[PDB]
Curated annotation (Swiss-Prot):
Covalent link Glycyl lysine isopeptide (Lys-Gly) (interchain with G-Cter in SUMO2), residues: 41
Coiled coil: none
Residues of the full protein shown: 555 to 674 of 1058
Tissue-specific expression: Highly expressed in testis.
UniProt name for this protein: Bromodomain-containing protein 1
Subcellular localization(s) per the UniProt record: Nucleus; Chromosome
Residues annotated as domain Bromo: 9-113
Top-rank lineage group of the source organism: Eukaryota
Subunit structure: Component of some HBO1 complex composed of KAT7/HBO1, MEAF6, ING4 and BRD1/BRPF2. Component of the MOZ/MORF complex composed at least of ING5, KAT6A, KAT6B, MEAF6 and one of BRPF1, BRD1/BRPF2 and BRPF3. Interacts (via PHD-type zinc finger domain) with unmodified histone H3. Interacts (via PWWP domain) with dimethylated and trimethylated 'Lys-79' on histone H3.
Function in brief: Scaffold subunit of various histone acetyltransferase (HAT) complexes, such as the MOZ/MORF and HBO1 complexes, that acts as a regulator of hematopoiesis. Plays a key role in HBO1 complex by directing KAT7/HBO1 specificity towards histone H3 'Lys-14' acetylation (H3K14ac), thereby promoting erythroid differentiation.
Amino acid sequence: SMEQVAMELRLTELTRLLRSVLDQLQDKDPARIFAQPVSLKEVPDYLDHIKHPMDFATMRKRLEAQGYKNLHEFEEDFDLIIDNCMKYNARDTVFYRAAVRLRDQGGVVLRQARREVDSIG
Ligand code: NA
């Protein structure tokens, strides 16, 4: 139908805007601490600690499949990255500190993305 096409074009455009959002957030992680899944070879007990692992590569896969239906879903996954890190790692670690910086710097990006998504529909 024409409506299914129109809905598909809206999802494509959302995907384009979330891709730019993801690029901007990942720039706030220049050490690449959150770029890939935590390695189960190297942290073999990780899944005993963290039930829903997340990282930027995994988000990018979902994004390119048009798997985010709205900005809320995308923010949920970003928040897992931060929140998982802040639980597994102690406050005095490079990892925890990197997550706090990512959260603080990403807040700005996500604030305007919410306005852009509401504005463009
Ligand atoms: Na902790």
